[PDB]
Amino acid sequence: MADKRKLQGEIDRCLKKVSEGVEQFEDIWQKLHNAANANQKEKYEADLKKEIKKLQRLRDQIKTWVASNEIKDKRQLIDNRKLIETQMERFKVVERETKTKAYSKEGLGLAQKVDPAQKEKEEVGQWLTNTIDTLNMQVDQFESEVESLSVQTRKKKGDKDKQDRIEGLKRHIEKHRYHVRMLETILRMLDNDSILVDAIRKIKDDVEYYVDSSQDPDFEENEFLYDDLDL
RNA sequence: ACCAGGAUGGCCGAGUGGAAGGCGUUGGACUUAAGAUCCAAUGCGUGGGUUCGAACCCCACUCCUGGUACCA
């Protein structure tokens, strides 16, 4: 089986080459994504191009081998071909992203081509602003009803239950304003990149729970809502 | 002649079943002007077959390339 052994040895050497080439492709990818200057970006892109072309030649060889009937268990060849194609797709994505011109036809409508962290930050800020709007609407409603009940008490000169409800509304407005001011602090910190999005999402559910129902008697107010974060 | 691989923009040339890149060409900017530089636009060798659809997988044809043609 000298011919079979020769083919096997060539296969093993080619697979080792593919492994090393994928390692180098990843290294060049990280270099490119760490680049700070356009020249660095272009040079790393060219190195990635050269490495992926080498990988493409190795993959042509792998496809020719797996086409052959000499090999019987070619699972390793299949896996290496899959890996090479994954690297090729990654490089194609990288090159299409970089080559695109800002004001060319394709570039005109790139839509939200912002870092996913930036998109999530914008979403969290928008949700905080909407919550602030809802809290302000609730505060306005509560203050209007407080004025109405004060007028009613003045006209009637009684209805102690109305005085109790007015004090309850006063406390509710106090808590709504506290929530609004804490939201404003959180958003201001987020804008300056001083707070994490995960930190905001850890209290998102509790803030939703409060806004959903806060004046009802069966209100389980968790005082430890803003206590986890030293705001 | 036998075996193997190729043929895709104008030149190189990637591509795998749901026309890229470099160079080049053209329009504008920069400069007195050119060059460099900047912002942009255009650009499957052949037939058949499977497939819902093949640049891609199979059959066949043309052009090229690589290796072999030994003992008397």
Author numbering: 1 to 231
Task: Give the authors' words.
Opposing these activities is the CCR4-NOT complex, a highly conserved multi-subunit assembly that functions as the major cytoplasmic deadenylase. mRNA deadenylation rates and half-lives vary by several orders of magnitude and are highly influenced by mechanisms that recruit the CCR4-NOT complex to specific transcripts. The CCR4-NOT complex can also be recruited directly to translating ribosomes to elicit accelerated degradation of specific sets of transcripts. A major trigger for CCR4-NOT recruitment to ribosomes is slow decoding, which is sensed by entry of the N-terminal domain of the CNOT3/Not5 subunit into a vacated E-site when the A-site codon is non-optimal and therefore lacks a cognate tRNA.
Recently, stalling of mammalian ribosomes on a highly non-optimal codon in an in vitro rabbit reticulocyte lysate system was shown to similarly lead to recruitment of CNOT3 to empty E-sites. In the previously reported structures of Not5/CNOT3-bound ribosomes, yeast tRNAiMet or rabbit tRNALeu,UAA, which lack the U13:A22:A46 triplet, occupy the P-site. We therefore examined the Not5/CNOT3-tRNA interaction interfaces in these structures to determine how alternative 13:22:46 triplet configurations affect Not5/CNOT3 binding. tRNAiMet has the most common triplet combination (C13:G22:m7G46), while tRNALeu,UAA has a trans-Hoogsteen G13:A22 pairing characteristic of type-II tRNAs. The distinct base configurations in tRNAiMet and tRNALeu,UAA increase the intermolecular distance to Not5 and CNOT3 in their respective complexes. This prevents the formation of the hydrogen-bonding network observed in our CNOT3/tRNAArg,CCG structure. In our structure, CNOT3 contacts the α element of the D-loop, but not the β element, mirroring the interface between Not5/tRNAiMet in yeast and CNOT3/tRNALeu,UAA in rabbit reticulocyte lysate (and data not shown).
